[PDB]
Design a binder for this molecule. Sequence first.
Ligand SMILES: C[S@@+](CC[C@H](N)C(=O)[O-])C[C@H]1O[C@@H](n2cnc3c(N)ncnc32)[C@H](O)[C@@H]1O
Length: 196
Amino acid sequence: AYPNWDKLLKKYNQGQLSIEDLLKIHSSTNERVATLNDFYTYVFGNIKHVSSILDFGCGFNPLALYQWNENEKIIYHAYDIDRAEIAFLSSIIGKLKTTIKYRFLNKESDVYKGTYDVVFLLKMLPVLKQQDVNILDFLQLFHTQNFVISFPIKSLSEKGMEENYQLWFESFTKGWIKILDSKVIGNELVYITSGF
Ligand SMILES: C[S@@+](CC[C@H](N)C(=O)[O-])C[C@H]1O[C@@H](n2cnc3c(N)ncnc32)[C@H](O)[C@@H]1O
């Protein structure tokens, strides 16, 4: 069920909910918890010095980054179409102490105007494709040097629904962006690419 943000915030403020509990709320972040350290170790290990990040369609990742981070110096810009979810996250993170500088964006038009060392599109391409977004044109909107593009790895166990994201992605990006590396991190296929 869609979360009751106001109620969740009250429970949290009362100590009835932990960050661990919160990370389980959004399935995309819940699925990443088991490999949280491996995910970020992989990303920052393959992308030399990130000072700025744009997390497009961020979900609860802002919270996951807080959980994983120790002392990174990064300006993290978070954007998601769900405004209420962003408001909730901003209220929680505003209560926390962290070296990462959070910037919650609410205007889509502002998103594409920034300059970011890297742009996160975690479990996003399928969603956008579904919304009939021209993915290539979309990717060209970002003034970034690298992308972190990931896809969920679904259970192998229906009819008429292909979804071979790996084949699709490595196929349509041919000659536009260069794939620097890719790896299966838990239930997620993560791609590290160049720009445009
Ligand atoms: C599969 S979830 C991925 C969440 C997060 N990126 C992660 O991997 O943990 C899809 C996310 O994209 C957001 N979203 C859907 N359509 C969007 C759009 N047109 N623009 C920005 N965000 C969108 C949803 O609210 C949701 O949080």
